[PDB]
Ligand binder design. Structure first.
Ligand SMILES: *[C@@H]1O[C@H](CO)[C@@H](O)[C@H](O)[C@H]1NC(C)=O
Ligand SMILES: *[C@@H]1O[C@H](CO)[C@@H](O)[C@H](O)[C@H]1NC(C)=O
Ligand SMILES: *[C@@H]1O[C@H](CO)[C@@H](O)[C@H](O)[C@H]1NC(C)=O
Ligand SMILES: *[C@@H]1O[C@H](CO)[C@@H](O)[C@H](O)[C@H]1NC(C)=O
Ligand SMILES: *[C@@H]1O[C@H](CO)[C@@H](O)[C@H](O)[C@H]1NC(C)=O
Ligand SMILES: *[C@@H]1O[C@H](CO)[C@@H](O)[C@H](O)[C@H]1NC(C)=O
Ligand SMILES: *[C@@H]1O[C@H](CO)[C@@H](O)[C@H](O)[C@H]1NC(C)=O
Ligand SMILES: [Zn+2]
Lengths: 294, 100, 246
């Protein structure tokens, strides 16, 4: 008549542990973000990117994601991640965005037209402001031409707005391009120093090696369960196995090219897989003329 | 708009008294770069209330023209600034406002 | 330096995929070094990488130290360096401008490379190298650079011993750079020195691999080598009975 099959009760996922974590506590909490004219270009790769710590850091004045969805930040994987750290004023935060033009945007740092990532900003009046004044931070307000996206300029040539060569000295129509922010505790919001770290995500023709951390569920044994072991998916009953694997081997297959054993990613243990019970169902019946019992 | 948290923190609206020595002429200060303060030894009187209105009118003017360049960061002529103060002072003392 | 030649015998077989098979004859199509193929013995500055390479070193002093891989071997194109010192193995994927003749002083690596303008990747691991024959297989497939290796005790003999030593995968790296030529770096003391290494080139082949009870490749058959091997591959059995087989 039909087939009888035991449905899985629970779903189990086992992935290798996340002992590798991206250096988010290095791009943030660096205690010195240099200046916007010379922005720190840090490469983040070959690590699991967990945004839980990023949320667990200080409340963000501006956390806007353009290319990568805030929900899918962990889901999406990228080959390389670039974080740019710099200190800018409150009103200069808006200029760091796609399609926005301003002094900082054109002469210091330009987000590309098709930028993918999230702009992270938070207030830094406590650390970056001193009563004497934080003259260390600088920005550029004079330059010959607009900067192309993702460019760094650190060379100070006396701006020749006039018709006569400056000869490398300051004077009439000869101004040093660099100008200093001054940060004091009494400054109002909008001129207070703001710390911005721009997360840039790029896809390259290579393995991503940067996938958000993936959760692990407790192992269920001797029960019909759905299982996803390090990318190997199936339905079955997981039992203890006498078989001994080699260190590099992770799966086991039989003569029929079907999976029969799997090595548990977290604790190295060989678990044999038995297909969940299935079988035909037959109805033994005397003639319905005689009786209806079966 | 309404006053800044920095304004509330830095401004001295009450007479310190005792050891502290200060001038008690009311003044609204636009120190620059987003700092606004009132230097006023304010007591609980109707004249002090109206003077507070006048000074906060000054600060609202200063906040409004903050965006413009430094040289132009002033009233259009010498009269408009105290005029903007005085209109608020006049409106504050109206019996309708007092009853409200 | 000295292009002599030798017979490879049944050497260079490795585990194709990370699966466990017990008492199974499995047929796999992959890049393998063909059996009884001539292998160059060194005792063109950059040896062509081709699809893959098989490198063998038998010196007791372990004087060989690392390898170099690149497309054009200049600052223009990305390159790969593997340096194995006594403590740990260092793999650096950087656009390396190398010396025309790379070698190391080993307490210094200055003699090796001229410049490293940008570094794409880095890795540090336990040292690879440990009457001992060290065999390595290098191949870059679908963007992953794979290194298989084996360390076999060999009795004193003139050539590669006749036996099966399956090479166990050591390192898989997601470097993703094109590799056209390679070179072997040698440790010289600033003293004359001599080292001998075997180079063979892998080819697309079909192999029949025997896995014993404990999942080790005990034996292998190269299908295209000889008619009997083709018969064994067709029947999928090492033992072939009397008869005529298409
Ligand atoms: C997961 O954590 C345990 C310790 O709790 C550790 O023994 C195990 O090796 C970790 N997983 C991996 C894949 O390293
Ligand atoms: C006053 O200013 C704060 C911001 O400082 C704002 O949140 C609030 O809505 C404003 N108005 C009132 C009625 O508090
Ligand atoms: C005034 O400033 C001096 C420093 O010049 C400081 O010691 C003092 O505490 C301040 N206040 C008063 C009431 O003197
Ligand atoms: C202004 O609006 C408030 C809203 O609660 C009201 O209480 C007050 O009476 C109004 N004032 C006048 C003068 O209409
Ligand atoms: C081996 O190389 C590593 C590279 O980081 C270095 O730290 C270590 O000191 C070296 N050891 C010796 C013995 O040369
Ligand atoms: C990274 O390497 C590439 C190689 O083509 C080079 O063009 C680029 O300038 C390097 N990055 C930096 C920041 O120098
Ligand atoms: C597998 O078992 C046999 C004995 O049955 C033993 O000789 C062999 O060494 C085992 N495999 C390995 C890799 O040790
Ligand atoms: Zn006034």
């Amino acid at each position: 008549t039909s087939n009888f099959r035991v449905q899985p009760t629970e779903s189990i996922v086992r992935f290798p542990n996340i002992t590798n974590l991206c250096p988010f506590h290095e791009v943030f909490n660096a205690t010195t973000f240099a200046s916007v004219y010379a922005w720190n270009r840090k490469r983040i790769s070959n690590c699991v990117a967990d945004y839980s710590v990023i949320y667990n850091f200080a409340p963000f004045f501006a956390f806007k994601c353009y290319g990568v969805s805030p929900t899918k930040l962990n889901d999406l994987c990228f080959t390389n991640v670039y974080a740019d750290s710099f200190v800018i004023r409150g009103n200069e935060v808006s200029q760091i965005a796609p399609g926005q033009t301003g002094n900082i945007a054109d002469y210091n740092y330009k987000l590309p037209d098709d930028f993918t990532g999230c702009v992270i900003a938070w207030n830094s009046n406590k650390l970056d402001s001193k009563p004497s004044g934080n003259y260390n931070y600088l920005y550029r307000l004079l330059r010959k031409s607009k900067l192309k996206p993702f460019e760094r300029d650190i060379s100070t040539e006396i701006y020749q707005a006039g018709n006569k060569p400056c000869n490398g000295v300051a004077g009439p129509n000869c101004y040093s391009p660099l100008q200093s922010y001054g940060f004091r505790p009494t400054y109002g919001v909008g001129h207070q120093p703001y710390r911005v770290v721009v997360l840039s995500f790029e896809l390259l023709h290579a393995p991503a090696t940067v996938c958000g951390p993936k959760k692990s569920t407790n192992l269920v044994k001797n029960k019909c369960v759905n299982f996803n072991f390090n990318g190997l998916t199936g339905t079955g009953v997981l039992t203890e196995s006498n078989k001994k694997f080699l260190p590099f081997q992770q799966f086991g297959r039989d003569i029929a090219d079907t999976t029969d054993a799997v090595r548990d990613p977290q604790t190295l243990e060989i678990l044999d897989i038995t297909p969940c019970s299935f079988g035909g169902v037959s109805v033994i019946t005397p003639g319905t003329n005689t009786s209806n019992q079966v | 708009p309404n006053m800044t948290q920095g304004f509330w923190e830095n401004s001295m609206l009450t007479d310190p008294g005792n050891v502290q020595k200060a001038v008690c002429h009311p003044t609204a200060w636009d120190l620059g770069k987003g700092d606004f303060r009132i230097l006023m030894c304010t007591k609980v009187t109707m004249d002090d209330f109206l003077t507070a209105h006048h000074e906060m009118g000054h600060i609202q003017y200063d906040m409004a023209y903050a965006a413009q360049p430094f040289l132009l960061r002033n009233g259009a002529n010498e009269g408009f600034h105290e005029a903007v103060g005085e209109i608020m002072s006049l409106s504050a003392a109206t019996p309708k406002h007092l009853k409200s | 330096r000295t292009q002599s030649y030798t017979n490879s015998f049944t050497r260079g077989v490795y585990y194709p995929d990370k699966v466990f098979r017990s008492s199974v004859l499995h047929s796999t199509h992959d890049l393998f070094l063909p059996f009884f193929s001539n292998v160059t013995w060194f005792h063109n500055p950059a040896l062509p990488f081709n699809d893959g390479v098989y490198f063998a070193s038998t010196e007791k002093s372990n004087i060989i130290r690392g390898w170099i891989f690149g497309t054009t071997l200049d600052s223009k194109t990305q390159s790969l360096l593997i340096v194995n010192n006594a403590t740990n193995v260092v793999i650096k994927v950087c656009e390396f401008q190398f010396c025309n003749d790379p070698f190391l002083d080993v307490e210094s690596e200055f003699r090796v490379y001229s410049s490293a303008n940008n570094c794409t990747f880095e890795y540090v691991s336990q040292p690879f190298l440990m009457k001992n024959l060290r065999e390595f297989v290098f191949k870059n497939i679908d963007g992953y650079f794979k290194i298989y290796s084996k360390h076999t005790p060999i009795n004193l003999e003139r050539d590669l011993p006749q036996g099966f030593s399956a090479l166990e995968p050591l390192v898989d790296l997601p470097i993703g750079i094109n590799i056209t030529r390679f070179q072997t770096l040698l440790a010289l003391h600033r003293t004359a020195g001599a080292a001998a290494y075997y180079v063979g080139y892998l080819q697309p082949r079909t192999f029949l691999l025997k896995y014993n009870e404990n999942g080790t490749i005990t034996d292998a058959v190269d299908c295209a080598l000889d008619p009997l091997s083709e018969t064994k591959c067709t029947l999928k059995s090492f033992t072939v009975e009397k008869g005529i087989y298409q």
